[PDB]
């Protein structure tokens, strides 16, 4: 139940320069509804309904979490881009919760790919059919990064079905797996629509952003999700839990490792991009702030529970913490009834 | 510096060979020669075909030299796989080595990459056209999981070369860049997964050991290559980027500190490779061990790395490390030193012309 959480969390928000933006609640609601609306109509189509084996309620919940993530973190991209990216990252989230073994549907993966025949695995059939809607927003380089990261993600989920935290002594396993299913290069590259940035003119800054954003994004997600995990835990295989199993250390030491990487990653993110192309730094900063805001506001992470047990407290953290938490709520706390409607199932049935 | 850290280099190298348990094997020179010729012969006939000759823009002498270095690497490291598998893998890893000879901006040939892939139309970049057309010969040797790893690593490698065309060592302060790039072009998962032919191993029964091997072998393989290459790249003003050189530029440290980092990672990686697999499936441990020993033997025997020079400079020096190094080197030579005239013939160009 550690409270160290707030120390690092505050340091984290300070390190990244967490502060208010020109992104209004009105604007968030506009984007949220637009993104949600296009995605919802997409997943409501009969073909999508047929091949995507997901419980409607879970699909509904996954779509809402994803749309929020995208709209709040990819603050600078067009509405359309937010929408298409929401569809793609909802597909990935849906695969993350699947238990259907991939082996039999991957036996002829390459030959079908090379031949142009539809993939046997239904998820691939849908994701690859839809991919162009995401890729049209980017140059060839960024596109390749999205394609690779998604392919990596697929392998990641395959490995995760084994629920394996690595052999004791296999120090390289934890991060190998985390990067495998982190979508780090997918996220990092999707931050640069060709409509706003020139892939060739900013090749060096984009490549660097992908390399650095990969670890920040996943580590920050691991840090935020830690609360919501040792609490209610079906036996998971998180980066932290794998550090324990593989590196043979205590859950505390593992969490300390994560925080040191997370803070150092943040510090370096600023050091490198502060004095670079201002448009770049803006996208990078908005993603970091948006990404944190999203974690604080989405109930899935139950960070709200942390809020209460600390408001009527008084320290150099719990104080700074709420000051931030409150800030997030002012722009991030939005009732789903204001944007997420009608439900996907309703559009599917119609 | 300007002077090569010979002492430091000798020490780590010895420690390396000890940590991995470097020792003689049942792999005879006669068997190596059999495999070398077989692998080379099939690959040479492949690269000698007109289509291959047309789309693969490479200087004949360089193609010839790259094929010979690769065949050696495969035959000596993938000791336990079939001759055919050694052959097909030799073709694949020769393709990858050759792509580093291209200066051509991939950008224009990648604009429609995904749509051509999804539609089943031949890729615009000629390298992809050849590699994807040939891939099935490599993939037929593996299960779906290992295959996916090979496909991903090769795609990663392509992006790696693209990035290397910029000759960029990373922005000072970008600590994550170096290894990001090294894994990008390391073929770590390609190598790691190609070690398990479905004919010898069950992808499903050994899923956990294979996945672990891929995760661990990725870093061992690339770091060991960086260390063995350190000598040849030391005074080479042409090779501006490398893991060590990028550590220097990105982490803002000295070439020495950078080399220290590499050695600590290399040794720790080795130590952990043994700790994890020693008591696991014996067939697995054997493939893993043979790859490590083979891989080191190959580095010591291939002139490309010019390690012979370091040997011939401490050949007779009564210090501990030096003698151990020379002993190890002599061991390698006994099974690894083979004249190309015994297996690499006729030249690819000759088969191409015919």
Rounded Cα distance, A348 and A187, in Å: 29
Sort out which chain B residues have CB atoms less than 8 A from A267's CB and list them.
Answer: none
Q: CA of A248: how far to CAs of A170, A241, B208, B283, B335, in Å? A: 9, 10, 18, 26, 39
Of B110, B118, B272, the CB nearest to A170: B272
CB atoms within 10 A of CB A299: 12
SS3 per residue for B110-136: HCCHHHHHHHCCCCCCHHHHHHHHHCH
Instruction: Give the chain A residue nearest B116 (alpha carbons).
Output: A116
In a mutagenesis test of the A interface, which of B121, B123, B147, B148 is the best target, namely the one with the most A β-carbons within 10 Å? B148
Chain B, window 219-278: residues with a beta carbon less than 8 angstroms from a chain A beta carbon: 219, 268-269, 272, 275-276
Resolution (A): 2.5
N- to C-terminal Cα distance for chain B? 50
Return the residue in B180, B205, B219 with the most chain A beta carbons within 10 A, the one to mutate for interface testing: B180
Query: CA–CA separation, B262 vs B273, rounded Å?
Result: 16
d(CA A213, CA A269): 8
Q: How far is CA B233 from the centre of its chain?
A: 16
CB A88 within 8 A of CB A130: yes
Q: Which CATH superfamily is domain B1-354 in?
A: Farnesyl Diphosphate Synthase (1.10.600.10)
Experimental method: X-ray
CA gyration radius for chain A? 20
Q: What is the DSSP string of A207-244?
A: HHHHHHHHHHHHHHHHHHHTHHHHSS-SS---HHHHHH
Q: Is A147's Cβ below 8 Å from some Cβ in B?
A: yes
Which tokens hold the place of A194?
A: 């060709």
Distance to chain B for A167, nearest Cα, Å:
7
Angle at A209 between CA A64 and CA B173, to 5 degrees: 135
CA distance B248 to B170: 10
For A208, nearest residue in chain B (alpha carbons): B177
Q: CA dist A166 to A161, A163, A174, B211, B282, Å?
A: 13, 9, 7, 9, 19
DSSP letter, residue B239: -
Q: How many residues does chain A have?
A: 350
Catalytic, A109? Answer no
- Distance CA(B7)–CA(B320), nearest Å, equals 10
The distance of Cα A298 from the centroid of its chain, to the nearest Å, equals 12
Reference A66, options A29, A98, A97, A36; nearest CA is: A36
> For chain A, percent helix, then strand, then coil, each to nearest 5?
70, 0, 30
**Distance between CA atoms of B186 and B158, rounded to whole angstroms?**
11
Q: How far apart are alpha carbons A297 and A295 in whole angstroms?
A: 6
Residue B10 half-sphere exposure toward CB, CA atoms < 13 A = 23
Task: Retrieve residue B330's tokens.
Answer: 């002599």
Q: What's B200's DSSP letter?
A: T
Contact: A113, B110; criterion CB under 8 Å: no
If phi > 0 it is left, if psi is from -120 to 50 it is alpha, else beta; for residue A52 that is: beta
Q: What is the C-alpha to C-alpha distance for residues A150 and A187, in angstroms, rounded to an integer?
A: 10
Task: Give the angle subtended at the CA of B125 by the CAs of B124 and B127, to the nearest 5°.
Answer: 135
Residues 168-227 on B with a CB inside 8 Å of A are 168, 170-171, 173-177, 180-181, 203-204, 207-208, 211-212, 214-216, 218-219
Helix/strand/coil (H/E/C) assignment for every residue in A137-157: CCCHHHHHHHHHHHHHHHHHH
Cα–Cα distance list, B110 to B124, B160, B348 (Å): 7, 14, 30
> Are A200 and B110 in contact (CB < 8 Å)?
no
Separation CA B188–CA B220 (nearest Å) = 9
What is the Cα–Cα distance from A300 to B222, expressed in whole angstroms? 39
Which token pair is B84? Answer: 């055919």
Residues in chain B: 354
C-alpha distance across the termini of chain A, in Å: 46
Q: Give the integer Cα–Cα distance in Å for A177 and A238.
A: 9
Tokens of B340: 């190309």
**What's the DSSP call for residue A119?**
P
Residue keyed to tokens 């900063």: A285
Return the half-sphere exposure (C-beta side, CA atoms, 13 A cut-off) of residue B57: 9
Domain ranges of chain A: 1-350
Q: Is A114 on the interface with B (CB under 8 A)?
A: yes
Q: In terms of Cα–Cα distance, which of A84, A66, A95 is closest to A298?
A: A66
The active-site residue out of A25, A96, A207, A251 is A96
What is the spatial distance between Cα B222 and Cα B191, in angstroms, rounded to a whole number? 10
Buried b / exposed e over A111-150, threshold 16 CB at 10 Å, is ebbbeeeebebebbbbbbebbebbbebbbbbbbbbbbbbb
By 3-state DSSP, what share of chain B in percent is helix, strand and coil, each rounded to 5?
70, 0, 30
Which chain A residues touch B176 with a CB distance below 8 Å? 211-212, 214-215, 265, 268
How remote is the C-alpha of A117 from its chain's centroid? 30
**What letter would DSSP give residue B3?**
S
| Torsions phi, psi for B351 (to 5 deg) | -70, -30
Does B8 contact A at CB distance below 8 Å? no
Q: Is A179 a catalytic residue?
A: no
Q: Which of A119, A144, A242, A266 to mutate to test the interface with B (most CBs of B within 10 A)?
A: A144
- How many C-beta neighbours within 10 Å does residue B21 have? 12
CA distance A265 to A11: 12
- Could you please state the CATH topology (level 3) that the domain comprising A1-350 is classified under: Farnesyl Diphosphate Synthase (1.10.600)
Question: What are the Cα distances from residue A63, in Å, to A44, A182, A187?
Answer: 12, 18, 17
A300 is catalytic: yes
Indicate the burial class of A172 (C-beta count within 10 angstroms; 0-12, 13-18, 19 or more): buried
């Amino acid at each position: 139940p550690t409270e160290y959480f707030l120390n690092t969390t505050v340091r984290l928000l300070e390190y990244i320069r967490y502060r208010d933006s020109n992104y209004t609640r009105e604007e968030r609601i506009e984007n949220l509804h637009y993104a949600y609306n296009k995605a919802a109509h997409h997943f409501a189509q009969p073909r999508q309904q047929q091949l995507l084996k997901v419980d409607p309620k879970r699909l509904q919940a996954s779509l809402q979490t994803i749309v929020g993530m995208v709209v709040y973190s990819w603050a600078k991209v067009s509405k359309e881009c937010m929408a298409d990216l929401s569809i793609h990252y909802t597909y990935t989230l849906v695969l993350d919760d699947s238990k259907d073994d991939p082996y039999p549907t991957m036996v002829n993966y390459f030959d079908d790919l090379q031949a142009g025949r539809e993939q046997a695995h239904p998820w691939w059939a849908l994701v690859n059919e839809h991919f162009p809607n995401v890729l049209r927003h980017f140059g060839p380089f960024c596109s390749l990064n999205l394609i690779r990261s998604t392919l990596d993600f697929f392998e990641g989920c395959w490995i995760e079905q084994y629920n394996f935290g690595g052999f004791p002594g296999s120090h390289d396993y934890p991060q190998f797996l985390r990067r495998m299913n982190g979508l780090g290069h997918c996220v990092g590259a999707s931050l640069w629509p060709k409509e706003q940035f020139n892939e060739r003119s900013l090749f060096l800054e984009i490549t660097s952003a992908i390399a650095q954003m990969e670890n920040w994004m996943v580590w920050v997600n691991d840090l935020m999700s830690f609360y919501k995990e040792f609490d209610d835990e079906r036996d998971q295989i998180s980066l932290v839990k794998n550090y324990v199993v593989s590196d043979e250390i205590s859950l505390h030491e593992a969490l300390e490792k994560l925080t040191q990487d997370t803070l150092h990653s943040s510090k370096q993110m600023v050091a490198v991009f502060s004095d670079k192309d201002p448009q770049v730094m803006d996208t990078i900063e908005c993603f970091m702030h948006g990404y944190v805001t999203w974690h604080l506001c989405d109930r899935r992470y139950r960070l709200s529970e942390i809020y209460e047990k600390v408001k009527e407290e008084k320290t150099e953290d719990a104080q700074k913490f709420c000051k931030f938490y409150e800030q997030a709520a002012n722009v991030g706390a939005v009732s789903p009834s204001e944007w997420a409607y009608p439900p996907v199932a309703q559009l599917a049935n119609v």
